[PDB]
UniProtKB/TrEMBL annotation, chain B:
Part of the whole protein covered: 487 to 534 of 534
Species: Acinetobacter phage AP205
Localization of this protein: Virion
Protein family membership: Belongs to the Leviviricetes maturation protein family.
Name of the protein this chain belongs to: Maturation protein
Length: 48, 48
């Protein structure tokens, strides 16, 4: 092919990434709630 | 007696070149080192 450059060269940005989470066995769910009384303290209860 | 006017193209398939073709002297120019801004792009991407 009579080209000045003998070999085609490409320079790809190569990116690798590995990551984990490491969560324990627990209940960040429903228990993650705002103050039960909130603004409804008018409702009477002692056992709740 | 003959009197008329005509206008003709420069048939750019055959003619129309014969000029500097400003592609060159700029394509052989910095297009490689300017592309080599991949270094700076990789730098910014690393901290991105």
């Amino acid at each position: 092919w009579n080209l000045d450059q003998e070999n085609l060269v490409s320079q790809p940005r190569h990116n690798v990434m590995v990551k984990s989470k490491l969560s324990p066995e627990n209940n960040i769910g429903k228990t993650l709630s705002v103050n039960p009384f909130t603004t409804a303290w008018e409702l009477l209860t002692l056992s709740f | 007696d003959i009197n008329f006017y005509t206008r003709q193209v420069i048939d750019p398939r055959l003619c129309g070149g014969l000029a500097f073709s400003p592609k060159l002297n700029l394509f052989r120019y910095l297009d490689a080192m300017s592309l080599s801004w991949n270094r700076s792009r990789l730098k910014i991407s690393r901290a991105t």
